[PDB]
Amino acid sequence: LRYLWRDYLYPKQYAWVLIAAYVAVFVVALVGNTLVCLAVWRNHHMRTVTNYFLVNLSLADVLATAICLPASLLVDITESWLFGHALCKVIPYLQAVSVSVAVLTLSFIALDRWYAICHPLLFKSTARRALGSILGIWAVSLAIMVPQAAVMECSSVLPELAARTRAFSVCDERWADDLAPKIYHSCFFIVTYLAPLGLMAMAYFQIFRKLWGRQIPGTTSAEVKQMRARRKTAKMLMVVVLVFALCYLPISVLNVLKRVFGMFRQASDREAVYAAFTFSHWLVYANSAANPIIYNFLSGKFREQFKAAFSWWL
Numbered sequence: 001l002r003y004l005w006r007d008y009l010y011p012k013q014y015a016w017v018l019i020a021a022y023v024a025v026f027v028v029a030l031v032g033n034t035l036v037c038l039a040v041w042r043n044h045h046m047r048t049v050t051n052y053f054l055v056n057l058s059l060a061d062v063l064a065t066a067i068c069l070p071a072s073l074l075v076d077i078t079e080s081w082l083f084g085h086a087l088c089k090v091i092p093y094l095q096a097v098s099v100s101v102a103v104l105t106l107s108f109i110a111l112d113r114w115y116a117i118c119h120p121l122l123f124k125s126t127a128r129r130a131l132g133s134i135l136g137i138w139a140v141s142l143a144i145m146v147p148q149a150a151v152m153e154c155s156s157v158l159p160e161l162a163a164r165t166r167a168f169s170v171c172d173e174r175w176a177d178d179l180a181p182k183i184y185h186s187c188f189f190i191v192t193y194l195a196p197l198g199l200m201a202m203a204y205f206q207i208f209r210k211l212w213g214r215q216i217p218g219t220t221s222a223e224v225k226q227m228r229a230r231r232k233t234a235k236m237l238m239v240v241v242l243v244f245a246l247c248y249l250p251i252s253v254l255n256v257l258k259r260v261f262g263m264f265r266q267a268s269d270r271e272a273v274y275a276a277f278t279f280s281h282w283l284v285y286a287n288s289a290a291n292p293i294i295y296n297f298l299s300g301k302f303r304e305q306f307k308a309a310f311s312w313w314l
């Protein structure tokens with residue numbers, strides 16, 4: 001009486017809205033993140049340790065936007081994998097790498113700020129060390145997401161059907177046992193979301209208490225200027241971390257409930273579940289669009305470069 005899987009199989013009633021949201025995010029993130037790289041290239045005064053990490057973040061974001069976003073939209077619209085076995089492993093792999101790169105870049109920004117502000121003369125923070133750390137971030141991210149690429153498999157509902165069309169193919173994780181996905185997704189959630197964001201929250205709170213706390217009696221002019229500039233960057237970075245945690249919260253929670261707790265298997269609520277996952281996928285991409293916008297409103301330096309770029313191209 002209520003089984004209409006094919007009516008929504010081709011297009012969904014919210015399908016156009018999803019296409020518009022995806023395209024809007026695609027354009028904004030590509031232009032904006034390119035502007036983040038070009039701003040840091042243009043202004044030599046902005047080539048700081050934090051800003052070097054921020055374009056690393058913009059590189060990770062551009063990787064996911066250019067390659068993963070188009071594929072994700074297609075998957076969410078058609079509920080089928082039309083790009084073959086190799087890309088079934090590559091595109092989810094690149095998304096996993098992009099997530100790792102982003103969270104570790106934010107972790108290293110928080111760590112730099114925390115040692116710079118709360119434990120000042122222990123570690124030396126140079127832009128050369130920052131480029132070394134950026135290389136390390138990619139090395140780690142590329143290595144640790146190989147298991148994810150290994151588990152991805154493209155499969156059609158009826159195996160001889162894959163020989164005629166890709167229309168009934170599906171890209172998903174293939175797990176030999178019930179326990180392995182539970183351990184894997186528990187570790188994926190903790191390592192790429194919970195633990196780094198918990199640690200970053202505590203770091204930014206300590207940074208906040210030092211920057212907005214008890215002023216040391218009789219500070220110099222140069223010390224108050226240092227504090228004011230650090231307050232500007234800290235305010236922005238806390239917004240970037242908060243937006244990241246908000247964007248990634250739905251999909252992280254959803255995947256945990258699905259993979260660790262075995263939820264959303266029930267056929268009664270399929271439609272609702274698919275809506276939830278679809279939206280969750282989108283804001284992952286929405287975050288890539290949001291970061292340049294954040295810099296425009298909270299960094300006068302970034303705003304200046306963006307204004308100049310808009311004047312040049314318009």
Ligand SMILES: CCCCCCCC/C=C\CCCCCCCC(=O)O[C@H](COC(=O)CCCCCCCCCCCCCCC)COP(=O)(O)OC[C@@H](O)CO
Pocket residue numbers: 107108110111114191194195196198199200202203206
């Ligand atoms: C390796 C892979 C991941 C990548 C990791 C990279 C991440 C790197 C990012 C930032 C580095 C900065 C570290 C932050 C420093 C931690 C700051 C901190 O300890 O928080 C305090 C209290 O909070 C407290 O309730 C302490 C209890 C913590 C609350 C427990 C909730 C779990 C959070 C879940 C997080 C997982 C933890 C991971 C550990 C390995 C603040 O108050 P308060 O000024 O009084 O202190 C006085 C103090 O000097 C005590 O002598």
Ligand SMILES: COc1ccc(-n2nccn2)c(C(=O)N2CCC[C@@]2(C)c2nc3ccc(Cl)c(C)c3[nH]2)c1
Pocket residue numbers: 068071072073075076091092093095096099148171251255281284
């Ligand atoms: C469209 O599906 C997505 C989009 C974003 C995702 N995501 N963003 C942040 C965290 N997870 C996920 C997702 O849950 N996971 C869990 C492990 C593998 C990973 C990262 C994955 N990335 C993908 C990228 C594109 C495509 Cl097309 C598929 C099928 C992907 N699967 C799925």
Ligand SMILES: CCCCCCCCS[C@@H]1O[C@H](CO)[C@@H](O)[C@H](O)[C@H]1O
Pocket residue numbers: 006007008010011
């Ligand atoms: C100018 C008026 C246009 C009317 C044409 C409408 C096209 C509907 S086709 C119909 O769509 C369903 C899903 O949308 C599927 O269940 C069926 O397989 C398919 O046959």
Ligand SMILES: CCCCCCCCS[C@@H]1O[C@H](CO)[C@@H](O)[C@H](O)[C@H]1O
Pocket residue numbers: 066067068069070071082083084085086087091
């Ligand atoms: C959405 C952005 C992702 C890029 C998608 C572009 C389509 C690539 S075609 C693809 O090339 C692969 C070569 O290895 C094979 O899997 C198949 O022969 C073929 O179908």
Ligand SMILES: CCCCCCCCS[C@@H]1O[C@H](CO)[C@@H](O)[C@H](O)[C@H]1O
Pocket residue numbers: 164165166167
């Ligand atoms: C009962 C299920 C219906 C299966 C029949 C669909 C016929 C295949 S059409 C089409 O043939 C093209 C040739 O170029 C390929 O490129 C595509 O993969 C495929 O989509």
Ligand SMILES: CCCCCCCCS[C@@H]1O[C@H](CO)[C@@H](O)[C@H](O)[C@H]1O
Pocket residue numbers: 151174175176177180181
């Ligand atoms: C000695 C170290 C061996 C390292 C090899 C990885 C651990 C194997 S577990 C097993 O691997 C399958 C592949 O067959 C996955 O698809 C399953 O989900 C998973 O349960």
Ligand SMILES: CCCCCCCCS[C@@H]1O[C@H](CO)[C@@H](O)[C@H](O)[C@H]1O
Pocket residue numbers: 177178179180
């Ligand atoms: C070397 C590779 C190791 C991969 C892990 C082994 C796969 C078997 S998991 C299996 O799952 C059940 C719950 O699903 C548990 O009750 C059992 O105790 C356990 O035996």
Ligand SMILES: CCCCCCCCS[C@@H]1O[C@H](CO)[C@@H](O)[C@H](O)[C@H]1O
Pocket residue numbers: 182260261
């Ligand atoms: C003899 C009775 C048979 C029991 C089989 C043991 C299976 C326990 S797996 C366990 O299931 C939870 C669901 O509540 C998940 O949350 C956990 O992550 C996961 O580790």
